Each structure stands twice: as structure tokens, then as C-alpha cells.
Amino acid sequence: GEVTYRKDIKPIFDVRCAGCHGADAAPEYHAFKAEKEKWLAKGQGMRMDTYSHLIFYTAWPDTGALMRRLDDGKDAKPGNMYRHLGATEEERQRNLAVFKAWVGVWNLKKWPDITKEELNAITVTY
Ligand code: HEM
Ligand SMILES: C[As](C)(=O)[O-]
Ligand SMILES: [Zn+2]
Ligand SMILES: [Zn+2]
Ligand SMILES: [Zn+2]
Which residues of this UniProt protein bind heme b (predicted)? Predict the structure, then answer.
């Protein structure tokens, strides 16, 4: 039943996200932030193509980022990565629904403003 990285997220990510967040992307977040021009010039972001690399953007250290960037916006600006979830709105919604199940709670808050109880709700099953 339960939605997991191996069964449900990685198949989507490998198609829709790894083009700019895999082998050609910055090896880590701060690697990107320190030399953005290098990566941006190739249309690349930072590595998210492994489970440990992706959960970085959920509870800690970059808490809420995956939730913020994939948000469909229901002030209604979607996050700037939502478009990558599919070629039609129906596809985007279906795939967004898989990420919300995986993450647990769709918490958009940033690290300094989040509570331990809220952190507990981020499950992110492998
Ligand atoms: C559904 C697939 C994708 C997911 C889940 C995803 C996720 C993310 C997240 C969470 C961030 C923000 C990292 C941070 O906190 O700073 C990000 C940034 C970025 N993404 Fe993606 N992304 C996806 C697809 C793509 C694609 C296909 C491209 C290129 C065509 C791309 C290019 C970038 C770039 C250049 C950044 C860094 C600049 C920025 O913050 O906008 N992403 N992505
Ligand atoms: C959130 As920090 C310590 O990388 O500025
Ligand atoms: Zn940092
Ligand atoms: Zn971030
Ligand atoms: Zn795309």
C-alpha cells in the first residue's frame, strides 16, 4: 500500500527531475549556492537523484523546500518546479498526489519556524 521512494517516487523523479538534478548537477546544495553560474549555464540545479539527496529538501536541512517547489498553489502561484510534474494539469495533479503521500504532511515552513512535532510528521518512507 504505502507510498515509498523505491516504488513510487524514484520512477517519477528519474523521468521528470533527474535531467537537471542528477549526474550533471551540483553534487550538493552548497556546492550549487557557491558557484551558481557554473551550474545554471547548463540549466542544472543540485543533485537530488538518490534518496538521501532528496530527503535533504523535506524535513532537514532544507526543510519544506520540496513541498514549496512542488506546490500547485491552492497567492495561487505554484512552486517553480510544479510544471515538471507533467505535460498536462491532470498528470501534474496525479504526480503531485504521489509526492504528498510520500512526504506525509505537506509542510511549507522553513527550518527556523518549524516545531519538532511537525518534523515528526514527515515520513518520507524509503
Ligand atoms: C519534478 C521534478 C523536479 C523536482 C522535484 C525538483 C525539485 C527542486 C527543488 C526542491 C528545488 C529547490 C532547491 C532549493 O531549496 O534551493 C529545485 C531547484 C532547481 N531546479 Fe528542480 N526540480 C525538478 C525538476 C527540474 C527540472 C526538470 C529542471 C530543469 C529543466 C530543474 C531545474 C532546477 C534549477 C536550475 C534549480 C535551482 C534554481 C532554483 O531554485 O530555481 N528542476 N528543484
Ligand atoms: C541554513 As545555513 C547554516 O546553510 O545558512
Ligand atoms: Zn545551508
Ligand atoms: Zn531550499
Ligand atoms: Zn520538465
Answer: 20-21, 69, 80-81
Give the distance (Å) from ligand 2 centre to CA of residue 65. 14
Split into its structural domains, the chain has a count of 1
Resolution (A): 2.0
Range of the domain at 109: 1-126
Q: How far, in Å, from the CA of 21 to the mean position of ligand 1?
A: 7
User: What would the grid cell of residue 105 be?
Assistant: 504532511
**Is 21 known as a binding-site position?**
yes
Distance CA 44, CA 71 (A): 21
